[PDB]
């Protein structure tokens, strides 16, 4: 079962004796998420970067005070499209035999590195998949984050910086990635993610939304908590996302095989239709990976889809692609 919320959600030291940072060993997997990467590199998750959904939910709550609903939604969304539903294992990065025997095509079980399932374009510190690497820390992109922090955040990363950088990244992908896609699930996650450094990488004794660049580099590049890092003082995920959207409101769309051809997609969900984002994720994205599953897969899909629905913001109706 998905873990419940923390019994005690106070700020506390999370870079502690039981959770030291260690460098990668051969075979250890890190991916496009600096949060999960850091949890793995401090042993909140298995240090090889392969974990169960329950391990992931417990780690994001314990290590960073990610809220339960967001933890559940993200984890089961990722697991459904990138994880092995039979073995209950998900790679936080590149596809690995460690997640076990694969299901039939067209399912990929590609880990979080898979492009276009969860991971997508206009990431802050990772390049678009089209440019060759959607997962490793990129120094040039991080230096741009520092520059935007200097220009809009007084040297710190905050929601104002997020609003400007989010837009810059979109516009750079429009200008250079002929395959740029910015619809549906990615349209939502691209905004929320930009709040996470301000909400979750800021020491919880401050919780002031102003992330310094030394801490930012430590998390984004080295998957390492600052010495003496306290987690956030209460559960939170994407609060302040409205600031980021309001800075430069966008419509969902994509380039259409050429640069500078961004074309709005009226079939995509947007922030006015959050339930549509959920329904399309299940009916189209998940169903297309598993169009006619065999018995054990069908049962695992339905279980994980029920868990996903627990993380859906209130008011949406559950959909059942494989029946009830």
Ligand X SMILES: Oc1cccc2ccccc12
Q: Does 237 bind ligand X (CB under 6 A)?
A: yes
Q: Give, as ranges, the residues between 191 and 210 that touch ligand X (CB under 6 A).
A: 191-193
Cis peptide before 47, with omega less than 30 degrees from 0?
Answer: no
Total residues contacting ligand HEM (rule CB under 6 A)? 26
Minimum distance from residue 79 beta carbon to ligand HEM (Å): 8
- Alpha-carbon 246 to chain mean position: 21
Pick 60 or 159: Cβ nearer ligand HEM: 60
Say whether residue 90 binds ligand X (CB under 6 A): no
Given the complex with ligand NAG, which of 88 and 119 has the nearer CB atom?
119
Is 249 among the residues that bind Cl ion (CB under 5 A)?
Answer: no
Helix 34-41 and helix 213-222, axial crossing angle in degrees, nearest 10: 80
**Which residues, at least 6 apart from 231, have a Cβ–Cβ distance to it below 8 Å?**
11, 12, 14, 63, 64, 65, 200, 204
> According to the binding rule CB under 5 A, does residue 58 interact with Cl ion?
no
Q: Which is nearer to ligand HEM, 123 or 269 (CB)?
A: 123
Binding characters for ligand NAG, 300-319, by CB under 6 A (x = yes) = -------------------x
**Min. distance of Cβ 190 from Mg ion in angstroms?**
8
Task: Provide the strand spans (E) within 101-220.
Answer: 181-182
Among 4, 5, 154, 249, binds Cl ion (CB under 5 A): 5
Q: What is the DSSP string of 146-162?
A: HHHHHHHSTTSB-HHHH
Burial readout 252-274 (b: 16 or more C-beta within 10 A, e: otherwise)? bbbbeeeeeebeebeebbbeeee
Phi, psi of 304 (to 5 degrees): -70, -30
13 has which bridge partners? Answer: 230
5 binds, among Cl ion, ligand HEM, ligand NAG, none (CB under 5 to 8 A by kind): Cl ion
Length of the chain: 324
**Sign for the pseudo-dihedral over CA of 92, 147, 251, 66:** positive
Residue 182 to residue 251: CA distance in whole angstroms: 9
- Residue 68 binding Cl ion, by CB under 5 A: yes
10 interacts with ligand NAG by CB under 6 A: yes
Residue 277 near which of Mg ion, ligand HEM, Cl ion, none (CB within 5-8 Å, type-dependent): none
Query: Is 316 within any annotated ligand binding site?
Result: no
Cβ atoms 152, 103 nearer than 8 A: no
Q: Does 179 bind ligand NAG (CB under 6 A)?
A: yes
| Contacting positions for ligand NAG (CB under 6 A) | 8, 10, 12, 115-116, 127, 129-131, 138, 140-141, 153-154, 158-160, 179, 181, 209, 243, 276, 279-280, 283, 319-321
| Contacting positions for ligand X (CB under 6 A) | 70, 73-74, 188-189, 191-193, 237-238, 241
């Amino acid at each position: 079962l998905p873990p419940g919320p923390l019994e005690n959600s106070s700020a506390k030291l999370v870079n502690d004796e039981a959770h030291p940072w260690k460098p990668l060993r051969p075979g250890d997997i890190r991916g496009p998420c600096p949060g999960l990467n850091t949890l793995a590199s401090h042993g909140y998750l298995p240090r090889n970067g392969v974990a169960t959904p329950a391990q992931i939910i417990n780690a994001v709550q314990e290590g960073f005070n990610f809220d339960n609903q967001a933890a559940i939604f993200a984890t089961y969304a990722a697991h459904l499209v990138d994880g092995n539903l039979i073995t209950d294992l998900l790679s936080i990065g590149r596809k690995t035999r460690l997640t076990g025997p694969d299901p039939p095509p067209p399912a990929s079980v590609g880990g979080l590195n898979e492009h276009g399932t969860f991971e997508g374009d206009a990431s802050m510190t990772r390049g678009d998949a089209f440019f060759g690497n959607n997962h490793d820390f990129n120094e040039t992109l991080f230096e741009q984050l520092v520059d935007y922090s200097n220009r809009f955040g007084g040297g710190k990363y905050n929601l104002t910086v997020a609003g400007e950088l989010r837009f810059k990244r979109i516009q750079d992908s429009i200008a250079t990635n002929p395959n740029f896609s910015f619809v549906d699930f990615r349209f939502f996650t691209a905004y929320g993610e930009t709040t996470f450094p301000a909400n979750l990488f800021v020491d919880g004794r401050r919780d002031d939304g102003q992330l310094d660049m030394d801490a930012a580099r430590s998390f984004f590049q080295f998957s390492r908590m600052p010495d003496d890092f306290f987690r956030a003082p209460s559960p939170r995920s994407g609060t302040g996302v409205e600031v980021v959207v309001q800075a430069h409101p966008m419509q969902p769309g994509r380039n259409v095989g050429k640069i500078n051809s961004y074309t709005v997609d009226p079939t995509s969900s947007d922030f006015s239709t959050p339930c549509l984002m959920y329904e399309k994720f299940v009916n189209i994205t998940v169903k297309s990976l598993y169009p006619n599953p065999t018995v054990q897969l069908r049962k695992a899909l339905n279980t994980n889809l029920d868990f996903l629905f627990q993380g859906v913001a209130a008011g949406c109706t559950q959909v059942f692609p494989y029946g009830r």
